[PDB]
Design a protein around this nucleic acid. Structure first.
Ligand SMILES: Nc1ncnc2c1ncn2[C@@H]1O[C@H](COP(=O)(O)OP(=O)(O)OP(=O)(O)O)[C@@H](O)[C@H]1O
Ligand SMILES: [Mg+2]
Ligand SMILES: [Zn+2]
Lengths: 226, 48, 235
RNA sequence: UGAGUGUUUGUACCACAUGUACAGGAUAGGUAGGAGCCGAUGAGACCGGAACGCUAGUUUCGGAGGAGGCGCUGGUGGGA
């Protein structure tokens, strides 16, 4: 029913006790027995209910340490913005014509950023991207006047966070390879952006439960005060 | 049935005038072009 | 849903006089009254189409699925598929969103803030009304009332009264509502079709207000009955 | 003005089970991570029981036996 490794990690974890953030990062590094560079992801169960148009939140947050996995960058740009993409060193720079080839080609690029003007040409393709979630969004900022900032943020490891329907928003803070101290710093940045992201119409405690888990490791409640 | 009524200015929502109308003879809200002292010009006043 | 001191008088003939009502959530309310009692008018108040002369009518923020007593055919040439598709705001937002993209090219640094916000809401709203519905609707007809696909390409005005009621009823369900306001949902339906509607409404977990002159149909569904009095102008 | 029993109920954890529309390999709940994962602490395949079941199958229990499968990959789909 449960692997011996998971069972040992479960005994390590305290269901009753919500760890501090530092204890949680250390404990996750302990729990991920499987010998692969598993990521560490945290879930916040917000009080807000997405179905209300105001309540639903969608944003993108940069991490000073990064995700621990590099990210490919796709850019839709024209003229000076293409020049800026080249300066930024984006993996791919494309035009309205190359979007068709991008459909079915150069796939697996982590994220897309399109210039405002391009969005009109991009949107036709974006209908395909919509279900994929690749299409850029102004609120996340992936639509920008300058592509350089988006490229460097993507390189820096910017993570897009979108509240799930159930109301638990999950985000990877970093790789187990990153030191527990770096992982907790990523978590602190995530917590701050969420607090600022709390909508006005929201009421009551913002977060019902915060749980940290490695890819293999089980969920660990983390004290909100910590 | 004749009843007292108030004519409110559409432009400023001011209840400038009092009058009366027969409901049966004038089922719909009465509308008149009357001078609005606040705006100092003729405006459409509708019963409320 | 709550109404206090409700008053409404069209000309000389009055509908509500100091009427009041409180409906709890998750109540399959059966609205009953003689013709002209003001049952349809109540929904118009809930839908904010009408305004009470005096009093307060309180409605929850949840999305409402409204089934009009009369079919709304904006144009004679509208096809059944066009009529049903209009239930969801997918098409309307895309037309607005497409214009937003046009403005983005025209405007460089003036309206971008407003356009970007409008684009963001439309995308988030569009994803909220998941654009996969194009396939779901096609199969909602099959599972709902065995509505043949040949009708799907036919002008709606040419359908039969019973057929129109199925389309209108399906459109309400297609909208994926939170509160159901059904105004005579079985006006033209035959015996077989009525069976499906009854079973679905029995299972429907949410609140559903039903205006019906079919006592047996209501008895199988209704748990609370609201009577609109024609002489006392009360509820 | 305090002890109990039982019954009917409301709330809250905690366990359990359940997710079959079209296509889809077929019983696809959503999100995130995921290349790797699970099994002599008894895997695969086989057999009986029981449950669910939209009748297509799914879940679970046990008999023997003993070491295997699953994933990624691939195509489908809005979604693997
Ligand atoms: N704009 C209006 N002007 C004048 N009278 C009106 C107006 N609207 C409604 N009325 C009157 O309101 C009265 C009741 O309203 P309503 O149409 O909702 O009755 P109803 O119970 O829904 O009818 P039925 O049950 O037969 O479908 C009608 O008799 C109608 O004559
Ligand atoms: Mg009516
Ligand atoms: Zn005036």
């Amino acid at each position: 029913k449960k692997s011996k490794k998971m069972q040992e990690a479960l005994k390590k974890v305290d269901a009753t006790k919500a760890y501090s953030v530092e204890e949680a990062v250390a404990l996750a590094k302990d729990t991920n027995i499987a010998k692969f560079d598993a990521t560490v992801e945290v879930a916040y169960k917000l009080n807000v209910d997405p179905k209300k148009a105001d309540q639903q939140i969608r944003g993108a947050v940069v991490l000073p340490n990064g995700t621990g996995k590099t990210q490919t960058v796709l850019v839709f740009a024209k003229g000076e913005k293409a020049k800026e993409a080249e300066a930024a060193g984006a993996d791919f720079v494309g035009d309205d014509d190359m979007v068709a080839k991008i459909q079915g080609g150069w796939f697996d690029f982590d994220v897309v950023v399109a210039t405002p003007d391009m969005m009109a040409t991009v949107g036709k393709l974006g209908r395909v991207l919509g279900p994929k979630g690749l299409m850029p969004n102004p609120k996340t900022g992936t639509v920008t006047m300058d592509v350089t900032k988006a490229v460097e943020e993507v390189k820096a490891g910017k993570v897009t966070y979108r509240v799930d329907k159930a109301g638990n928003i999950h985000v990877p803070i970093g790789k187990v390879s990153f030191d527990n101290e770096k992982l907790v710093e990523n978590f602190n940045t995530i917590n701050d952006v969420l607090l600022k992201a709390k909508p006005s119409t929201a009421k009551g405690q913002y977060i019902k439960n915060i749980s940290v888990t490695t890819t293999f490791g089980p969920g660990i409640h983390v004290d909100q005060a910590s | 049935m004749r009843v007292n009524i108030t004519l409110e200015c559409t432009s400023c929502k001011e209840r400038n005038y009092l009058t009366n109308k027969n409901k049966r003879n004038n089922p719909d809200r009465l509308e008149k072009q009357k001078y609005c002292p606040r705006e100092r010009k003729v405006t459409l006043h509708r019963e409320t | 849903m709550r109404g206090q001191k409700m008053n409404l008088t069209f000309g000389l003939e009055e509908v509500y006089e100091d009427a009041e009502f409180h409906l709890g959530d998750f109540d399959k309310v059966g609205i009953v009254g003689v013709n002209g009692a003001g049952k349809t008018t109540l929904f118009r108040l809930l839908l904010r189409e009408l305004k009470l002369d005096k009093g307060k009518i309180t409605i929850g923020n949840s999305r409402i699925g409204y089934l009009p007593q009369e079919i709304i055919i904006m144009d004679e040439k509208m096809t059944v598929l066009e009529f049903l598709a209009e239930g969801r705001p997918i098409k309307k937002m895309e037309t607005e969103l497409n214009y937003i993209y046009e403005k983005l090219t025209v405007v460089d640094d003036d309206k971008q803030d407003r356009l970007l916000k409008r684009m963001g809401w439309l995308q988030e709203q569009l994803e909220y009304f998941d654009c996969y519905e194009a396939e779901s609707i096609l199969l909602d007809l099959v599972d709902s009332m065995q509505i043949d696909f040949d009708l799907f390409d036919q002008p709606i005005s040419e359908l039969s009264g019973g057929q129109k009621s199925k389309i209108s009823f399906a459109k309400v369900l297609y909208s994926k509502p939170e509160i159901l306001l059904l105004d005579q949902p079985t006006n033209h339906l035959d015996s077989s079709t009525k069976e499906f509607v009854t079973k679905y409404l029995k299972s429907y977990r949410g609140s559903v207000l039903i205006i019906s002159h079919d006592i047996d149909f209501l008895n199988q569904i209704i748990d609370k009955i609201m009577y609109i009095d024609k002489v006392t102008h009360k509820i």
